[PDB]
């Protein structure tokens, strides 16, 4: 019931705070299953009224919280070069650490929960949960899907513009952050039912279909330049450092962080 659901969300929001770059949004599993299709491979095996929380990161996750974590790890390992050698997966390591701290408190409020990440997969490499769909049904961010922007006798999107095993995918836009955010995790509480809860509708960000199609092209074809993130004209944005980091392949990223821990000062 709903006081308990609110107490659960409160612990999450205490330990994964807005200031450090997290948000949470409540939704019902039934809303997700209705959207993906009740018989789709993505349908989740919980009753319709089961409580879930979507956790997303905002610009300060990287710029503030992760920066603090990298500074500390550098101190712990003794040098930046040592951290780089020993921590191949810094973003996921940071998130795992923060989620464990949260979970230690959350277990005392509701002991039974499952956690699915944006990167979680089955052994067949199917994503376990579709985050943009969660974001839309939870009202967190409007999900712009290519299949919703077709025109009769128009071939859009182009075919064969992207590399192997890549599809032309949709894009969610947040009402504060545009594309300067990411989905991170969903917590599912199988023993907590919230049938009376009504999710808010996601705010429309792009109202003209030609802007949507342009945004989707910028995302699929040009994402390294982060232009897609500025649709909706957000004022709260990823830093330059953060856009450089996520625009690079993982093997080239650590050097972007060197100044955080090796510079006496900045100028
Ligand atoms: C399965 C199908 C395709 N979608 C997917 O397969 C996406 C899954 C996944 C894991 C995302 C996380 C996740 N767990 O969701 C993530 N990627 Co990928 C890391 N990605 C990849 C994968 C392939 C990308 C590709 N182009 O094919 C890569 C690893 C290469 C990948 C790479 C990137 N990715 C990137 C990003 C940012 C994201 N990626 C996402 C999409 C996500 C959500 C991850 C995140 N964390 O937030 C990012 C986008 C956020 C946003 N603002 O929307 C990016 C830029 C990361 C980077 N900096 O390097 C980079 C390039 C993006 C690009 N456009 O190519 C993948 C696979 C994903 O979903 P679908 O929505 O089309 O179908 C679905 C269907 C299922 O039955 O029902 C639903 N439905 C039906 N009707 C209705 C609805 C739903 C609603 C709401 C309705 C109202 C009606 C809905 O239509």
From Swiss-Prot:
Location within or outside the cell: Cytoplasm
Sorted UniProt keywords: Cytoplasm, FAD, Flavoprotein, FMN, NADP, Oxidoreductase
Single GO biological process annotation from the record: glutathione metabolic process
Cofactor binding comment, as recorded: Can utilize both FAD and FMN.
Cofactor: FAD; FMN
Binding-site residues, substrate: 118, 129-132, 143-145
InterPro entries with a match to the protein in the record: MMACHC (IPR032037)
S-S pairs: none
Gene Ontology terms: cellular component: cytoplasm
Record-level Gene Ontology MF annotations: cobalamin binding; cyanocobalamin reductase (cyanide-eliminating) (NADP+) activity; demethylase activity; FAD binding; glutathione binding; oxidoreductase activity
E.C. no: 1.16.1.-
CDD domains tied to this protein: MMACHC-like
Function (record text): Catalyzes the reductive dealkylation of cyanocobalamin to cob(II)alamin, using FAD or FMN as cofactor and NADPH as cosubstrate. Can also catalyze the glutathione-dependent reductive demethylation of methylcobalamin, and, with much lower efficiency, the glutathione-dependent reductive demethylation of adenosylcobalamin. Under anaerobic conditions cob(I)alamin is the first product; it is highly reactive and is converted to aquocob(II)alamin in the presence of oxygen. Binds cyanocobalamin, adenosylcobalamin, methylcobalamin and other, related vitamin B12 derivatives.
Assigned protein family: Belongs to the MMACHC family.
The protein, known as: MMACHC-like protein
Species lineage: Eukaryota, Metazoa, Ecdysozoa, Nematoda, Chromadorea
């Amino acid at each position: 019931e709903m006081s308990h659901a609110e107490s659960i969300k409160r612990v999450v929001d205490q330990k994964l705070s807005s200031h450090e770059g997290f948000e949470s949004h409540m939704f019902k599993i039934g809303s997700y299953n209705e959207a993906v299709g009740e018989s789709s491979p993505f349908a989740l095996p919980y009753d319709d009224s089961t409580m879930a929380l979507l956790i997303l990161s905002t610009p300060d996750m990287f710029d503030v919280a992760f920066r603090k974590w990298v500074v500390q790890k550098t101190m712990d390992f003794g040098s930046f070069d040592e951290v780089c050698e020993m921590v191949s997966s810094p973003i996921q390591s940071f998130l795992e650490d923060r989620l464990e701290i949260m979970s230690e408190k959350l277990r005392k409020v509701e002991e039974n929960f499952e956690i699915l990440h944006d990167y979680s997969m089955t052994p067949q490499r199917r994503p376990k949960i579709l985050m943009q769909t969660c974001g839309h049904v939870a009202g967190a961010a409007f999900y712009y899907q290519p299949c919703h922007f077709q025109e009769d006798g128009v071939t859009w999107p182009p075919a064969g513009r992207m590399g192997p095993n890549l599809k032309f995918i949709g894009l969610s836009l947040h009402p504060i952050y545009g594309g300067h955010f990411a989905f991170r995790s969903v917590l599912i509480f199988p023993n907590v039912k919230i049938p009376e809860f009504c999710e808010k509708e996601p705010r429309p960000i792009l109202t003209a279909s030609e802007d949507v199609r342009t945004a989707l092209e910028k995302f699929n074809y040009n994402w390294k330049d982060s232009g897609f993130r500025d649709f909706g004209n957000p004022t709260r944005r990823y830093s330059t450092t953060q856009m450089e980091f996520f625009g690079r392949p993982v093997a080239e990223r650590w050097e972007v962080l060197r100044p955080w821990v090796e510079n006496l000062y900045f100028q």
